[model samples]
Target chain A: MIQRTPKIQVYSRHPAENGKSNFLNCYVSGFHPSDIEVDLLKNGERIEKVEHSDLSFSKDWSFYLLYYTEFTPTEKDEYACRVNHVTLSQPKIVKWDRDM
Target chain B: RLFPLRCLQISSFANSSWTRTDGLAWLGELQTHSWSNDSDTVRSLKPWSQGTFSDQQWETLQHIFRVYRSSFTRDVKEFAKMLRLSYPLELQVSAGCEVHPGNASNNFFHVAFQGKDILSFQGTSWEPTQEAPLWVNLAIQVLNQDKWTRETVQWLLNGTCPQFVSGLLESGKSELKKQVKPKAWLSRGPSPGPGRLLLVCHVSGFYPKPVWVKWMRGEQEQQGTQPGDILPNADETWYLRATLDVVAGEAAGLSCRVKHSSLEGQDIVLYW
Candidate 1:
């Protein structure tokens, strides 16, 4: 049985209601088989200040999982998220591209 | 069932690799397409480069979607007979059906309505070698003779899915009834600025949505009582904020009224 691969994306949310605290999320969705891993990167290495969450589903029945981490706006300009699974030889990469 | 405030999007990876370990995992390309049914205005949000769709392509996509909409809508119409909707007005008879490909012979199929498992069927993964094992027979039967997708109708099957899936649409329907009180408030920007005092009503700690918040001056409802999107509070509970631009020093007369499922027939009123 073949299914859809994980579509990678990155987004940010303002933690504070009135201010921007800069919380970012790297989510891979619409994939199958829950055995998957995600890595947040700052300068090509793993990012320590990050939190991962469980995989979930889309309303269309496609599946998804999320990994999020916080970063200061002035600290770094480049950030990426790497996805790993038994289905891939290389990691699927997603970079921070939000207009500040 | 959990289509949040961001809007309903059908997003998937470009191509799906074969689920089998045939060593040649270069299966094929799955075309990217985005569909939103919130209204009759927007049709397909093309996934190529994001927002690169033309009016023609959109119309073409909607024309194409008419096929799917008709098919899915027909299925839902029949499914309405057995949608198991507790509140048809609010509870959408939403169905999330998919063909899971894990085991070579155990390609799984599942369908749910409003997060409650309605029906399921298993198809042989390797049954049709060159084709996808989507229970085309079942799909056809569901589209035609049988008029419904699944039969036995299990609410939530207790295996394979992660704990969150079970928690998402889990049985008993207790999550919607979870009680959490709202804390309302009023605040303004630029220290209320020159001509206006922003009457802000911030409500937190609510559950199962459909919460209504309004700004009022004594018994009269104020105009422009704007509320933000219902957001999560890190505890699976939800929160919201409604605001209004009222006359200066009128916070004393202004009131915020909040109604939630937990409050049952009453509204929580607060004065700044």
Candidate 2:
């Protein structure tokens, strides 16, 4: 009865095949009532380069779509992806620290 | 173990040329939703559950969805390729993951075989093997590794569901987790019996799922119900519907119960 809220995640690299660790991917999915807005941030400021999925559903409309973007990190970069959905009071931002 | 739904608003049609009115006075109690999450999107959905709603049927609905929009085409080769690439051996998979805006939980994933349920394991820790295609087994493990499932469900249990409903309903109402409103209407449909008319409750444009929709007559069910699948909107909302049969001029004892995630333990019985 509920589409779980969206989870904006930080992955060291993604789409898996590219296998590039220098690449950082941020993504979100699952929240229903779709109308989701996603943003990527670096060093506390929004970044311009990003890739995204077209709110795609599973083959059966069972699950919502997945969103993802890849970025190359520089020296000691702090990166995050911000998710805006009807389920959240405000923007949900997820960050990754190279040190971790 | 986990799946993410990318949905939008609640916009639907009834047999074409029948856009729902925001409020039809006669629709005073008609429900506006026609589809649900379990029946329309996931492995626990309509066709899989119904057994009668087959692959061809789903494709037909999608085809209609596209035909109505125009400027659309379904490539046969692409279709064939999908069939070719899909995990064969007649398998079924159900996966879901929840989310919170910039939020985190220990939600879980659900998988099934053919429409039969498999595992309802914690998203962060599911590592079971099943008998099926390689991709299917691999898919199950991938979902298990996804940790957001628990965090997503935790958001709801922590009492943020209502705020989510409000947010999806387009309310700029703080970081509030409360329920929202949906648009309910009534439509006159084909006659179910001689001299008797069928009235449809079209409940649409609502957020969060699990709406309590039913047709009642003065504190009683009018008759047996004819329900529809919970269809998803492109903007992320879901829709549902219920129907009633009434003799002309005998429409007084009809009403609808619409309870959504916006409020806890609230089911408003709107009247016609």
Candidate 3:
């Protein structure tokens, strides 16, 4: 039987002009060696995939992924990424102050 | 023969009527009689006088004749001014003529005369009932000022002065502002699932050109990435979208990254 993974919440900061914030520096945390594959999608299209060992896990045994892609976001759009066979988190709609 | 003396007198005083019949007769007679003498003596005498005067008196007479002959050319200026004042209103430049200073080369002075005066001074001191022919007179005056030509005027009119330069710069800036594109974001689906965790990352806004999209598990970049799509916006902005799929148990940690020309340094990353 396939065990259900708890829904993880995804949070994002505003894209920075200098690419220092969410734009240039982005990371995903809470992963294990058992989680082998990770995939990221934009608009239902696969944009990235990574192996578990390629990620760094902290001393607490919690693993976090840091990846930077210079793509711009828009309003009313959904972005999703997953690790292994389980969805790592709930899709976060790119929300702006104006949109909110 | 009877009018020859009168012809000679008038020619000496006013340099007019040189083409009259009596004038022609006097000129012929003077030439023939003077030629009979020594060539130097003949050359020294005035055309109007036989051999009666000395070389100095003849020279003075010749100088006086030339002075009057050239006076007619000076009257051309007055004629030009009259044309300018009489020019029609439809041509626009109705104001009086204005003479500008010499240009860079100091070759000639620039005159900025009006086209045609259209003012109605019914009772004023500057009463101009007819359309002032300023432009016409300008044309005539410019021609009359043979030392200067229309070429000089045209150059001054089209020169890269402050006003024209400023106008051109403003126009270019306006066009660039129109062409600038605004920031935009794009993304794909949040496929529903029971244990299916959805990862949402916020991409940064970027200029329209040179954009790239990719995904990474952690610090390591991934391959076989699908192309992200961008959409057009009316506000000179754009939107981008992409997606990835995963099962519940396999979901753990993942991130999406975006790259664009307007962005500096590495790609912008969004993670779950």
Q: For each candidate, what's the DockQ?
A: 0.03, 0.01, 0.02
Question: Quick one: ranking by TM-score, best first?
Answer: 1, 2, 3
Better of 1 and 3 by TM-score: 1
Give lDDT tens digits, candidate 3, residues B1-272.
11111011111111222211111111211211221111222232333233234566446544543443344334433544555433211111111111123322111121112212323212111223254444444444444444333333334333322222233233333322222222334343455755553333334334343466665646587543454434322222443444455554544455667766555565666654
Give the best candidate by DockQ. Answer: 1
* Interface RMSD, Å, model 1: 11.9
Query: Model 1 off-target regions past 4 Å?
Result: A1-100, B1-11, B16-176, B190-197, B247-252, B264-266
Task: Give the TM-score (0 to 1) of chain B in model 1.
Answer: 0.40
Interface residue Cα RMSD of candidate 2 after superposition: 19.6
Cα RMSD (angstroms) for every candidate in the order listed: 18.5, 23.8, 36.7
Q: Name the weakest run of 10 consecutive residues (lDDT summed) in model 2 chain B.
A: B21-30
lDDT of 3 by residue, A62-90 (tens): 33444333344655544555444333344
Which of the CAPRI classes, incorrect, acceptable, medium or high, describes model 3?
incorrect
Candidate 2: where is the Cα deviation over 4 Å? A1-100, B1-130, B133-178, B220-223, B263-266, B270-272
lDDT (10s digit) by residue, model 2, range B3-63: 1222122222221333211110000011212232223332221112222335775455345
For the predicted complex of model 3, DockQ is 0.02
> Which residue pairs clash in candidate 1?
A30-A63
